[PDB]
């Protein structure tokens, strides 16, 4: 197993947290990809991943899996320990639902603000920008923060009483929010308490 | 099991196709939701689904599952027959990857065009638009069609040799593209051949039109 990624980027972070949760950090080789230098856009990399994104998981049979959720699915399945994606149809459905609320409402909404409404990665990489869309997505991010705060008033973690991929996604979303200077409203006590608990997990520290 | 949905909308279609594939249509009670009248946006409905979307799958214990992929996960898991979401870690991962390419690149891309760059559902429902985004997303949709055509040259279905959720998502995306008047380039022979074979499946009526009033 090889993971092609870029240290310091939030999607690669998600996969590194998942891998640590599965106790499998040492079971992969990490291969740096120079995103800032456009390596992810080259024809060699596009052959692995037509999305031209990092991270990419490449198996020993040449299969290349892209996207955080798909990668987490694989890692969750082949390694033991608690189930990040769920162990029954109900649990898998609930986790999936909550993970997508985090991903679309926070992670990708902050992303859209960063990449569209700020300089983002600079003009070489941000080849078309729509700042109106980006600024709206910052609002979506903040409304999602408030929703997750409500969930976390009644639940230890996003999907119930156990840590799952939904928590990893939301956590990375908050880290990304801070980097992008999207304010996390200070009255969201439950979200902030959950954040400190998650940040203290050994997979993240 | 209850499914709250709206005939003629493409995300409800995806769930109805998956239910039929799992041979479970008769296990659910369908409850109509009047999206054109704003029912999905009310307080009662938002308590079931804070996303304010259809379809919503309400289990007998009251658990409400929203989003097509989560609902499909539930249905694929509980019922037997072929595995729409995969039966090994590698297959699950490949199907997920292809399903998200179809969903983000085609289904949601056509959706963004429709709701942002056209009149969409009309001004009572389309409360804010960003037409520049919508137009960019039509381009994304057409690029995705070309990509799927290349996949389908080498694979019978999107994820390999079996029909999966990825095919459902892509099929609904093409139906949506036609409704929205996003042209499917006529030279994409593999995509078109796949589409005809999918449409003929007994889970898919083939008559089914998207529509709203």
Separation CA B46–CA B196 (nearest Å) = 37
Same domain, B91 and B54: no
Same domain, A16 and A109: no
- Asked whether the beta carbons of residue B89 and residue A78 sit closer than 8 angstroms, the reply is yes
Residue of A nearest to B91 (CA): A74
- The phi-psi region of residue B58 (left if phi > 0; otherwise alpha if psi is between -120 and 50; otherwise beta) is beta
Burial string for A27-64 (b: 16+ CB within 10 Å, else e) reads: ebebeebebeeebbeeeebeebbebbbbbbbbeeeeeb
Same domain, B89 and B194: yes
Within 8 A by CB and 6+ apart from A9, the residues are: A35, A54
Same domain, A130 and A105: yes
A88 chain-B contacts, CB cut-off 8 A: 77
Same domain, A106 and A91: yes
- Asked whether the beta carbons of residue B77 and residue A59 sit closer than 8 angstroms, the reply is no
Same domain, A142 and A131: yes
- Asked whether the beta carbons of residue B70 and residue A96 sit closer than 8 angstroms, the reply is yes
Same domain, B9 and B92: no
Q: What are phi and psi of B87, to 5 degrees?
A: -120, 5
Inter-chain Cβ pairs, chain A and chain B, closer than 8 A = 86
Q: Which of A66, A92, A97 is nearest to B83 (CA)?
A: A92
Q: Give the domain CATH number at B211.
A: 3.40.30.10
Q: Give the domain CATH number at A106.
A: 1.20.1050.10
Per the document, the length of chain A is: 205
Separation CA B58–CA B39 (nearest Å) = 16
Same domain, A94 and A189: yes
Place of tokens 């959950």: A194
- Asked whether the beta carbons of residue A74 and residue B89 sit closer than 8 angstroms, the reply is yes
Within 8 A by CB and 6+ apart from A82, the residues are: A21, A162, A163
CA B88 from centroid of its chain's CA atoms: 24
Q: What is the nearest CA distance from B97 to chain A, expressed in angstroms?
A: 6
Q: Does B133 touch chain A (CB under 8 A)?
A: yes
**Range of the structural domain that residue A43 is part of:** 1-83+202-205
Resolution in A: 1.7
Burial class (CB in 10 A: 0-12, 13-18, 19+), A99: buried
Within 8 A by CB and 6+ apart from B199, the residues are: B171, B206
User: How many domains in chain A?
Assistant: 2
Q: What are phi and psi of A31, to 5 degrees?
A: -115, 115
Q: What is the nearest CA distance from B71 to chain A, expressed in angstroms?
A: 6
Separation CA B54–CA B66 (nearest Å) = 7
Same domain, A100 and A75: no
Burial string for B85-120 (b: 16+ CB within 10 Å, else e) reads: bbeebbbbbbbbbbbbbbbbbbbbbbbbbbbbbbeb
Within 8 A by CB and 6+ apart from A127, the residues are: none
Separation CA B39–CA A171 (nearest Å) = 33
Q: What is the nearest CA distance from A200 to chain B, expressed in angstroms?
A: 29
């Amino acid at each position: 197993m090889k993971i092609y990624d870029t240290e310091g980027f939030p999607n690669p972070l998600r996969v590194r947290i998942a891998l640590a949760e599965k106790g499998a950090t040492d079971k992969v080789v990490f291969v740096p990809v120079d995103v800032m230098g456009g390596e992810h856009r080259t024809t060699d990399f596009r052959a692995k991943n037509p999305d031209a994104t990092v991270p990419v998981l490449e198996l020993d049979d040449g299969t290349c899996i892209a996207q955080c959720n798909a990668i987490t699915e694989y890692l969750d399945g082949v390694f033991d320990g608690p189930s990040l994606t769920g162990a029954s149809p109900k649990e898998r459905a609930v986790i999936a639902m909550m993970n997508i609320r985090a991903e679309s409402g926070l992670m990708n909404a902050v992303g859209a603000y960063f990449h569209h409404a700020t300089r983002g990665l600079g003009p070489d990489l941000e080849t078309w920008q729509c700042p109106d869309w980006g600024n709206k997505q910052k609002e979506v991010a903040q409304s999602t923060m408030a929703y997750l705060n409500e969930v976390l008033a009644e639940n230890e973690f996003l999907a119930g009483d156990r840590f799952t991929v939904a928590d990893i996604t939301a956590y990375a979303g908050l880290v990304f929010a801070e980097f992008a200077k999207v304010d996390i409203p200070g009255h969201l006590d439950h979200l902030l308490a959950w954040r400190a608990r998650v940040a203290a997990r050994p997979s993240i520290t």
